[PDB]
Design a protein around this ligand. Structure first.
Ligand SMILES: Nc1nc2c(ncn2[C@@H]2O[C@H](COP(=O)(O)OP(=O)(O)NP(=O)(O)O)[C@@H](O)[C@H]2O)c(=O)[nH]1
Ligand SMILES: [Ca+2]
Ligand SMILES: [Mg+2]
Length: 146
C-alpha cells in the first residue's frame, strides 16, 4: 500500500522541482519515497501528472498571481467532482525565495486556503525549504481522514 499524491497547478510553478527534491536517497514519471511521519512509516508515490489519488497538491508561484487564481479554480473544480471521499487538498505557494517578485502574500494564500477548505504552506524548491514539511503534512492529512 502506497499513498498516491498528485501534483497540480499552472505551468512553471515548480511542480517537477518539488517532486524531484522529495526523492530522495532511497529506493521507492512517479516518485516513490518512504518517510517516517510521527513515528509511523508511510510510502509516498508522488505523481507529476503534467510530465488513484490519495491526495492532491496544488502548486502556485508567489511571484505569479495568475497561478494563484488558477489554483482556486482547480480547488473549486476538484470539490465539484469528488464527493464524498473528499481526499485532503494542500495549497502550496512555491518560490518563496524570490522575495522581490512576490505578488501573493503569505496571508492571502492562507486566507484562500482556509475558506476553500485547503491545507496551506509556502515552500522553496530552490532552497529546499518546507519541501519535506509539505509531504509530511500530506501524509499527516491523508490519515486524519480514514
Ligand atoms: N527561484 C526559484 N526558482 C524556482 C523554484 N522552484 C522552481 N523554480 C524554477 O522554476 C522553473 C520551473 O520549474 P518546474 O519544476 O519545471 O516547474 P513546472 O511546474 O514543472 N513547470 P511545467 O508545468 O513546465 O512542467 C525552473 O526554472 C525552476 O528552476 C523556487 O523555489 N525558486
Ligand atoms: Ca526515494
Ligand atoms: Mg514539469
Amino acid at each position: 500500500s502506497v499513498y498516491k499524491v498528485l501534483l497540480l497547478g499552472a505551468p512553471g510553478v515548480g511542480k517537477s522541482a518539488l517532486a524531484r527534491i522529495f526523492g530522495g536517497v532511497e529506493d521507492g514519471h512517479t516518485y516513490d519515497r518512504s518517510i517516517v511521519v510521527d513515528g509511523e512509516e508511510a510510502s509516498l508515490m508522488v505523481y507529476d501528472i503534467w510530465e488513484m489519488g490519495d491526495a492532491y497538491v496544488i502548486v502556485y508561484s508567489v511571484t505569479d498571481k495568475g497561478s494563484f487564481e488558477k489554483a482556486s479554480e482547480l480547488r473549486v473544480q476538484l470539490r465539484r467532482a469528488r464527493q464524498t471521499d473528499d481526499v485532503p487538498i494542500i495549497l502550496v505557494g512555491n518560490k518563496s525565495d524570490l522575495v522581490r517578485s512576490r505578488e501573493v502574500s503569505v496571508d492571502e494564500g492562507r486566507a484562500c486556503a482556509v475558506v476553500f477548505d485547503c491545507k496551506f504552506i509556502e515552500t522553496s524548491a530552490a532552497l529546499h525549504h518546507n519541501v519535506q514539511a509539505l509531504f509530511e503534512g500530506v501524509v499527516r492529512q491523508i490519515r486524519l481522514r480514514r
